[model samples]
Target: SVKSEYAEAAAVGQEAVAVFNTMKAAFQNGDKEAVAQYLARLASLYTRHEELLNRILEKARREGNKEAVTLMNEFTATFQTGKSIFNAMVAAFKNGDDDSFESYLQALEKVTAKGETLADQIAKAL
Candidate 1:
């Protein structure tokens, strides 16, 4: 069930990436409303993704899979940072700080990219 859980997490996480791209376009166009809408969906997807990750991590620990545990820990940490950057993005938007907004967007984009790589590693670990 651990890999199954990771599979679900990756699916949800991938959906979040798709939403992230849409939000990126909205951000580029200065469409605050559109961005907010996408953020709403992103938040839900992210929560589901994290929930699955936690479940997978717990299972991995119980199974005594040290490799999966390490990979899962890193994967979780990456997403946590992603979440923080997303919050920063929201703050930038609220303050109308265009420079910071764009910077945070780029940072988040990288985070997602990094997440993809980590997910792959986790898949292998599992």
Candidate 2:
């Protein structure tokens, strides 16, 4: 009845988003150890997300879906940006500069755009 196409798994996306929020909360709590743990877990989940995206990307490319391919690439860049922020957050924790870490949160929040953050978008996308 319908053509085969990419569609994200809502359950998987919701779980991933929830995990990111947990990481956010852990950072906000100023518990360095907890934050570190969340970061590690979140990073592993995100890598798994990227793997799913890559599978979809491969399908899109095979079908000549240029626009999907572009979004897929951009989304991957956003994931890398998130990694950059988390690494800096860890460094900030090491230096015990909560202010720097919090400031970086703004950058992280605006990775793709205000309100329409990369993580949320990627979750909804295939």
- In terms of TM-score, the best-performing candidate is 1
User: What lDDT does model 2 reach?
Assistant: 0.64
Whole-model lDDT values for every prediction: 0.86, 0.64
Residue 6 of model 2 has an lDDT of 28
Error of 1 at 86 (Å): 0.9
Q: What is the TM-score of each candidate against the true structure?
A: 0.92, 0.69
- Candidate 2, TM-score vs. the true structure? 0.69
Q: Candidate 2, which ten residues in sequence have the lowest lDDT sum?
A: 1-10
Candidate 2 stretches with Cα past 4 Å from truth are 1-13, 112-126
Q: List the residue pairs that clash in candidate 1.
A: none
Steric clash pairs (candidate 2): none
Tens-digit per-residue lDDT, 1-126, candidate 1:
677777787788878888888898888887889988987888888888888888899989999999999988988898899989988887887798989988998999887786777789889888
Q: In model 2, what lDDT does residue 109 have?
A: 64
Give the range of the ten consecutive residues with the poorest summed lDDT in model 1.
1-10
